[model samples]
Target: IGTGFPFDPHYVEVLGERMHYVDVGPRDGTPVLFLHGNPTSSYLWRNIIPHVAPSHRCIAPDLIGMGKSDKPDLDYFFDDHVRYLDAFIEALGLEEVVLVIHDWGSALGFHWAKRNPERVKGIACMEFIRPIPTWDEWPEFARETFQAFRTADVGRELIIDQNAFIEGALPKCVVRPLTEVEMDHYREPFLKPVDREPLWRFPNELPIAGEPANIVALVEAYMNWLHQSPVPKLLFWGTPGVLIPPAEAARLAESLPNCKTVDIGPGLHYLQEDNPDLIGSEIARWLPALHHH
Candidate 1:
């Protein structure tokens, strides 16, 4: 995983914007869609893909404005990314697809499954945005850290101008230090200050204390679906997880129907970075069950 994203490049036009993706494995195999979070691209799943590619088709797309994807003149809001993700799936005409998601990718993937239940085969998620919390629910550091990100001039200076999120927040989340080559790939996209707009905007999209009313409602809607949906879900949690901690994860696994929870060893926010092979093998082991359902 440290070397670099090794997959051959692929791109598609989605609603006038181009999205970069890595598509591999046999076309006839079952489809496994891997979605990543903010400040990260398809590169996050690089090591995991090989473990499942033998038996399934793996697709990891860089969200628009991240990675090599085209950064069009748009707000880069949560809903905007959701629309493009929906269109990207529609354009591909995928059905009975399995979703592998983490971080904001969880928000997008869960919402997609909630809306299009008939098309989804199963969901595999980790460190996702769920059980949207109020500001009071946040840890001391998180509340203060995120509040600054949501502010206007200060947020812009921190994210877009200073590129603090990449240099500051991103590395701390990982257990081991990332290679310079790996960091460079992430830094490669936002070469210009304007290119970093999406980085700043993602934090703003986060729903806290019901301020971002629409997203909170959306999270609630999806939470309800998640509670009821019979779709098999695999939840991978770390020892002391980031957003979804072990205690809450235990509750979610028990409450969600047909859900299996696995502790993928020590991890922070990004499980893929910490334990890709563990996560990938488990998904491969779990894939056949979903494929038959």
Candidate 2:
């Protein structure tokens, strides 16, 4: 995946762990931070970054245990991820950030933005959204998958042992199948069971049964902030998307203070692979307007 990857490698010590990232474009350019989610890394954004790199400072980081970042002996819980992300932002002295996120990255970015709204200039998100608050709020299909991942025996066999996330879920989530070379890049990080801990842990953290009150509260807080924040927000979704359906995206756009949604055509959870050009161009077009706001 690193082959012909346009950016140079960089790292910073955040909470005693080396957080790996790609810092590209001009330092004086507008700060646009890209945060990826489970079973993937900054490599996920390789195709999308270059379009904006000419005009924006694109910084994509591999969260703690994923990618080239050091995988320490940690539980990889929500707070653990957030703590490191918070420290990462502070360590880099980033402010007025234009955050672009997906999956768990949505949760982490929104949670951080709610607390430091003044520091966040804008948001561009896909797939993941605010917490459901209850199982009743989830679609039956989503419920089943969530339940499966939360199951101990099944999750262990799928995620940790066979690397199902990278081998199965990752590929299934995109409309355009990843190339063998791309698959190799993603599979490279979690070659051992120990290294795959984060992938297994993420699905378990989903707030079902109203448990994990802290995470639920964090999501609730961000949901509330989304309604009130005047920060420029852009939401992208694809047809037949697994996580955020058309209806949900519409609801989100309506509730947000200043927001817009674009349908990038057919795709699944990892729409970036299928619609990188659309995503990149939309963001490139939208961002200049945000700066003036």
Candidate 3:
């Protein structure tokens, strides 16, 4: 699976699971933490990390049950993810983190930052945003997609049985089609149906109709914090993606303090794969400016 991921792997025991991460650049350099969402891992930041690593300590951890991380027999719910993440941060003693997050990572990172506002320096976000509290609040397309995933048999067939999320959904979320080797690396982790517990459970945790009350409350609380916090924030988006379309992006930008939005052009949910150089350079440029404030 030599798809050009150039970093050596390290593991930390968090919540009885071995959470794997790629730690690059100087030990004492500025800390930039990259968190990825479901069905993806630290591998998502392989190209993006190098550009900023020269002057920053870049750390990208594979969320529990995904990527090179150890998989325990657990539900992988929103609470489960947060519990492991909290332990992971404390285990590593990370402080003053500059967060870069996408997909479910956006939600996880935002919730963590909101609770420990002093520990966060800034945020660079994309794709996912704070969850809409109710089903009625979601856009039409998002509602339809959520319904399909929420369906019992259909969700199982697609995400669990067939591995369609890695094979089908993820490929379509990028503008540039994934090469065979790249696809292989992503598919390698969840070869069996039993191994796809995390993939399937993430969709089930969506706070539709406020069914998952805990997750809904967390999202609402963080959204409130995001609006009031003066932390430096950067949002990157692209075309033809299910998450964070133009209107929603504009709304979020207006609500966030000291925030800027940049259209990276012609990509989808996986914009990192489509425009890694642009995302990296923009972040590299933005991080230094935060220090001056």
Please report the candidate that would top TM-score against the real structure: 1
- In candidate 1, clashing pairs total 0
Candidate ranking (TM-score, best to worst):
1, 2, 3
Q: Residue by residue across 189-267, what tens digits does model 3's lDDT show?
A: 8977889989888878766677677777888899889999999999998876557787777887898889999888887
Query: Where does model 1 exceed 4 Å of error?
Result: none
Each candidate's number of clashing pairs is 0, 0, 0
Model 3 CA deviation exceeding 4 Å by range: 1-3, 133-145
Superposition error at 162 for model 2 (Å): 1.6
What is the lDDT, from 0 to 100, of the residue 250 in candidate 1? Answer: 98
Give residue 47's error in model 1 in angstroms.
Answer: 0.7
Summarize candidate 1's per-residue lDDT along 113-202 as a digit string, tens digits. 998898888899999886456787754546677899998999999999999889877887778788888788778888788889889989
Worst 10 residues of 2 by lDDT: 1-10
Per-residue lDDT of candidate 2, residues 13-70 (tens digit): 9898999999988787468999899789998898889778888999899999999999
Which candidate, 1 or 3, would have the higher TM-score against the true structure?
A: 1
The TM-scores of all predictions, comma-separated, are 0.97, 0.94, 0.94
Per-model RMSD to reference: 1.2, 1.9, 2.0
Given candidate 1, what's the lDDT at residue 174?
Answer: 79
Please report how far candidate 1 places residue 38 from its true position, in Å: 0.4
Q: Which candidate ranks first by lDDT, i.e. highest?
A: 1
Q: List the residue pairs that clash in candidate 3.
A: none
